[PDB]
Design an enzyme around this catalytic site. Sequence first.
Site, PDB file in Angstrom:
ATOM      1  CG  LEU A 237       4.757   1.609  -0.211  1.00 36.58           C
ATOM      2  CD1 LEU A 237       3.345   1.094  -0.120  1.00 36.58           C
ATOM      3  CD2 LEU A 237       4.831   3.086   0.154  1.00 36.58           C
TER       4      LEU A 237
ATOM      5  CG  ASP B  98      -0.180  -1.528   2.897  1.00 36.51           C
ATOM      6  OD1 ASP B  98      -1.283  -1.216   2.402  1.00 36.51           O
ATOM      7  OD2 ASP B  98       0.732  -0.701   3.099  1.00 36.51           O
TER       8      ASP B  98
ATOM      9  CD  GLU C 143       5.878  -3.015   8.200  1.00 32.48           C
ATOM     10  OE1 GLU C 143       4.979  -3.427   7.436  1.00 32.48           O
ATOM     11  OE2 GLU C 143       5.998  -1.807   8.509  1.00 32.48           O
TER      12      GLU C 143
ATOM     13  CG  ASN D  79      -1.586  13.494  21.898  1.00 29.93           C
ATOM     14  OD1 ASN D  79      -2.276  14.298  21.274  1.00 29.93           O
ATOM     15  ND2 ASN D  79      -1.520  13.484  23.221  1.00 29.93           N
TER      16      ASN D  79
END
Length: 175
Positions: free
Chosen positions: A43, A31, A22, A143
């Site tokens: 956030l 961001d 971050e 995935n």
Amino acid sequence: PTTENLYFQGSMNIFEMLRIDEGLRLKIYKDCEGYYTIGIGHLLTKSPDLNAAKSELDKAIGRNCNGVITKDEAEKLFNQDVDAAVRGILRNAKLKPVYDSLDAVRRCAAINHVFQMGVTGVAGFTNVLRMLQQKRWDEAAVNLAKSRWYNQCPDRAKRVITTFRTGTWDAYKNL
Ligand SMILES: c1ccc2oncc2c1
């Protein structure tokens, strides 16, 4: 591995992990997805109104920040955000069993993923969760690499994916 190398896993934990993913910013910034953010990946809001972001900031810190905070304040907020992610996993009937099945390093990657995406986003990853519980690490990583989370912002997610694949801290070495 050298003596020093074997010490490296003891220096890594969820806080150091997310700190790398971050970064650390003391002023409001946008961001990789354009959302107002501060500190260590906090956030503030998804609203495009900076005034909304500043309002959230002052609420979160508890003083008039005018968009700027201290290192100590960033760390307090970060600790709160980490605790929220951990609490979000442990109370969730879908995530907890998977988290419990994981080793300590992959548990960090789990907390990281939830810190980044939130509980419902992660819990919606039905196939990945099954793969992780079944220790199908390569499949799980492939995935995850299909997800919008990774693909819209690869640099913030790539190390987490590698960590799910390997269960080691290697992606966090040699910054
Ligand atoms: C909590 C438990 C298992 C998980 O797998 N990926 C993210 C996550 C979060």
